[PDB]
Design a protein around this ligand. Structure first.
Ligand SMILES: N=C(N)N[C@@H]1CCCCNC(=O)[C@H](CCCCN)NC(=O)[C@H](Cc2ccc(O)c(N)c2)NC(=O)Cc2cccc(c2)CNC(=O)CNC1=O
Lengths: 40, 149
């Protein structure tokens, strides 16, 4: 079970990047196992 | 252990992504479950982790301390399986929890993109992508998950 890493890039901000996605405001809960769920 | 963003692979399948900064490798716990990592010919051992935060660091303590300012657009430096690293800009939403608000990004990528860094305009890593919720239409919203340095 060989788990390994390989470099993929430099960490930089890219000027004039594509902007997408909305900005949802959600009520959520986080349990002790690190799982988020919606509060409905 | 040169600074940068890395794919986390198993042998190959990409199971996630992480950040090398200040000699410490940072990823989400669910990517590795704390298992040791090979880097070229060297072994990286876990140092710190927290299941509830879904984070783990290797070779030293968590180094990423920048925080979302609660106002500005951010960039996901997405490293999807089989695709080159790319930056996607977005205005975060909010996870409202009993313990406070967490910035959150409504960007949906394959599971193996877990651990991709989220950046502020100075290029600082304000958290990692990939612990989130599935909303009613089936799309995904990720917390901006950041540790404590
Ligand atoms: N479902 C999607 N549209 N997009 C997701 C994006 C995955 C991005 C990387 N993160 C992960 O893999 C983590 C791992 C586990 C970390 C746990 N502490 N994941 C997640 O947070 C969520 C957690 C979750 C699960 C169910 C929920 O009701 C809520 N509130 C939250 N886990 C999933 O969605 C699983 C899932 C659910 C439904 C359909 C799919 C996958 C099929 N989609 C894909 O295989 C690729 N896309 C996908 O898998």
């Amino acid at each position: 079970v060989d788990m390994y890493i390989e470099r993929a890039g430099d960490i930089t901000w890219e000027k004039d990047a594509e902007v997408t996605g909305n900005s949802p405001r959600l009520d959520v809960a986080l349990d002790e196992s690190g799982d988020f769920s919606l509060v409905e | 252990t040169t600074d940068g963003v890395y794919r986390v692979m198993t042998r190959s399948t990409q199971v996630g992504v992480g950040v090398m900064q200040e000699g410490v490798f940072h990823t989400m716990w669910h990517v590795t479950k704390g298992a040791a990592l090979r880097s070229g010919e060297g072994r990286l051992d876990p140092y710190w982790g927290d299941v509830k935060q879904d984070l783990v660091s290797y070779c030293g303590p968590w180094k990423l301390d920048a925080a979302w300012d609660g106002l500005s657009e951010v960039q996901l430096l997405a490293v999807p399986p089989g695709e080159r690293a790319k930056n996607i800009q977005t205005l975060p939403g909010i996870f409202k929890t009993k313990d406070g608000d967490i910035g959150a990004v409504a960007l949906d990528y394959p599971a193996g993109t877990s651990g991709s860094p989220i950046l502020d305009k100075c290029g600082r890593v304000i958290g990692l992508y990939g612990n989130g919720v599935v909303i009613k239409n089936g799309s995904y919203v990720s917390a901006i998950t950041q540790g404590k340095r």
